Chains A and B, each alone.
Chain A
């Protein structure tokens, strides 16, 4: 049936996968032991858990995910946790040497050594499943583990499975703040691979997360846990009609088919709402029109870009919780007549209606409060091309005099690949500008 396989590469990928798994187990009432010890007071769990979990002959649940990392310092950190009794050690493959924000090593001399094992693991996982639709590849552009190994594995998965959807989820180096210096080195090479060998790609950063948390959640000392929780909530909202049902079920194929207008333009703009704290969810009446209007505000986007700079070509619209169709219709009628929101002179309308009867759940000790309904949007606009423009400008500044290139040369790789990636990104930007201009 509707079953998918998740891929977690790098420390960020592993932590995001762990957050998603814990969110799923708490929202489905799955106990950390892996069984159902709730024999006195039941609290749920009679649902379709086969989408993500698996049912054994003894009542045990086995996660279906790929936790791979070149550094063992993440594998052991996860292993010494309280959920170590849930997964299996075979799914967590350690490593001697790692990339650690390096592409050449992790693509040629490090990632090429562990290939057969992960391919066997993923083949076994696919064989254990009946119906396969897409994959959940979690990685990062900054992390060398999440760039070189991710690229080399996805290049093989694309040629081994063409009929299956190939998703992408990673972290974008923010133009203002950054973690490392060699991030554009890996990004310029990873973007080509994700563009010319994948079907869809989702891009997010952390500075927007910081802005939204300090603006709504009002926290002075943030932490990665909230960042992971937001991503897990977004992932659950996207794949909400798969584990459950509703008035209009929206599967992966239902939205990815329309979310891709062109083979070159597959970078949607996600926006989760409401991103609020507990006190921000008590004295605030919540309807559908207001949150839908707020979804188009630049302050609530996870990508730093003004939507008014470009215009929208395609929009994918989702919901989760007790949502009434009349409110959706009223919101659509309001936004279709809004002069602020710009759109092409050709596509008068496009969106989806995903009604989910199951409201989003909460977490004990987290910051998310109890909201009756949730909302997530996936639009396509040309105003986001500036990020690629800034990345190309950076690559030009940091390639003109060949800073930190002799290391890659010594590792072994073609210098002309930099020019190839540069010209490919320039061609992509030209295609984006040609699509953005109307008649």
Chain B
């Protein structure tokens, strides 16, 4: 397949991809605030997921999200409110496969369940690695805690 792309159409396709990226980047900026709130800090992860909350939403809508060892946060593709669902709020995390739109479940103080679909299998392996670190250590938080207050 890489062959196909190489000898057939590669360079002109990548010039057109130049053009398509330029078309996208010149349009909107509200996503910038979300990413700035997410980039490179105690926030372990920074990426976009299609979101299912409780049965409030049973249909996918791409949103933006945040992942701290102490909190999880999310925004609706440019939401004004930095919506907060902390690790200290949530009590479980699971992986769900909804019609090959693969997603990560989590259950919260509040009788809440959030289902967050990061797009494709590598992006999902990445976000699931970060969550299998972050909230599973928020569950291992119990056996990691006893050292830093007394």
Instruction: Identify the A interface with B (CB < 8 A).
Output: 393, 396-397, 400-402
The docked-state distance in angstroms from the alpha carbon of A396 to that of B146 is 9
**Shortest distance in angstroms between B133's beta carbon and chain A's nearest beta carbon?**
20
The docked-state distance in angstroms from the alpha carbon of A401 to that of B146 is 5
Chain B interface category by residue count: under 10
Residues of B within 8 A of A396 (CB): 142-143
Q: Check if A401 sits within 8 Å of B142, measured CB to CB.
A: no
Q: Is B20 an interface residue (CB 8 A)?
A: no
Residues of A within 8 A of B150 (CB): 401-402
Q: Is B149 an interface residue (CB 8 A)?
A: yes
Residue of B nearest to A399 (CB): B146
Specify the main secondary structure of chain B where it touches its partner. loop
Additional 7 contacts, C-beta under 8 A, given A397-B142, A401-B145 = A393-B142, A396-B142, A397-B145, A400-B145, A401-B146, A401-B149, A401-B150
Q: What mask results when residues 109 to 150 of chain B are scored 1 for a CB within 8 Å of chain A, else 0?
A: 000000000000000000000000000000000110110011
The docked-state distance in angstroms from the alpha carbon of A299 to that of B143 is 34
| Interface pairs (13), CB distance under 8 Å | A393-B142, A396-B142, A396-B143, A397-B142, A397-B145, A400-B142, A400-B145, A400-B146, A401-B145, A401-B146, A401-B149, A401-B150, A402-B150
Residue of A nearest to B148 (CB): A401
**Shortest distance in angstroms between A67's beta carbon and chain B's nearest beta carbon?**
41
**Shortest distance in angstroms between A402's beta carbon and chain B's nearest beta carbon?**
7
The docked-state distance in angstroms from the alpha carbon of A402 to that of B150 is 9
Residues of A within 8 A of B146 (CB): 400-401
The docked-state distance in angstroms from the alpha carbon of A397 to that of B146 is 9
**Shortest distance in angstroms between B138's beta carbon and chain A's nearest beta carbon?**
12
The docked-state distance in angstroms from the alpha carbon of A68 to that of B50 is 62
**Shortest distance in angstroms between B120's beta carbon and chain A's nearest beta carbon?**
36
The docked-state distance in angstroms from the alpha carbon of A397 to that of B145 is 9
Residues of A within 8 A of B145 (CB): 397, 400-401
**Shortest distance in angstroms between B140's beta carbon and chain A's nearest beta carbon?**
11
The docked-state distance in angstroms from the alpha carbon of A247 to that of B133 is 63
Residue of A nearest to B143 (CB): A396
**Shortest distance in angstroms between A419's beta carbon and chain B's nearest beta carbon?**
12
Residues of B within 8 A of A401 (CB): 145-146, 149-150
The docked-state distance in angstroms from the alpha carbon of A393 to that of B91 is 13
**Shortest distance in angstroms between A390's beta carbon and chain B's nearest beta carbon?**
12
**Shortest distance in angstroms between B91's beta carbon and chain A's nearest beta carbon?**
11
The docked-state distance in angstroms from the alpha carbon of A401 to that of B143 is 11
